[PDB]
Amino acid sequence: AFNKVQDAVNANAMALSKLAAELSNTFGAISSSISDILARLDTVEQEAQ
Amino acid sequence: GFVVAVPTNFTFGVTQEFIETTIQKITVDCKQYVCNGFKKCEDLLKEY
Amino acid sequence: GYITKAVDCGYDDLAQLQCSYESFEVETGVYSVSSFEASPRGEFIEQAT
Ligand SMILES: *[C@@H]1O[C@H](CO)[C@@H](O[C@@H]2O[C@H](CO)[C@@H](O)[C@H](O)[C@H]2NC(C)=O)[C@H](O)[C@H]1NC(C)=O
């Protein structure tokens, strides 16, 4: 009955870490950063990445 | 006074009811499900 | 910043557990695991003349 007090604290924190970790994924693009896609490609290839 | 309808005969009636207590437990091998053991697929899955 | 410990993920089954759940502390239980072994293949070719 005490292990459910900690499992709510852990559930609160696991939701926030799955938000911040989806910003370092590239999802198959050349980079996870928009300022690098805009600096390496041209205007018709930027829109696909 | 008042009128009251009181029983003079009876039966026993049976009500049935199902309550579900469990489901089937399933574990999935995620690597074999997605990439089927191909190394070219497994390097593309690191981007997700 | 230094690598303190490593796990070869194809050595035994505790290593497959640690690499399948991606943690070093594993919290006593019964777990289903994935395969990380190489197992070099052969060839079976059969076509008609
Ligand atoms: C209460 O109702 C039941 C059923 O309506 C009565 O049982 C019947 O009794 C008669 C005479 O004994 C039989 O011929 C029938 O076959 C019975 N029916 C059934 C379904 O068993 C019962 O007599 C009633 N009780 C009173 C006090 O009226």
From Swiss-Prot, chain A:
Acts as a viral fusion peptide which is unmasked following S2 cleavage occurring upon virus endocytosis. It comes from Bat coronavirus HKU5 (BtCoV). The chain holds residues 1015 to 1063 of 1352 of the full protein. It comes from the Viruses. This is Spike protein S2'. Residues 6-49 form a coiled coil.
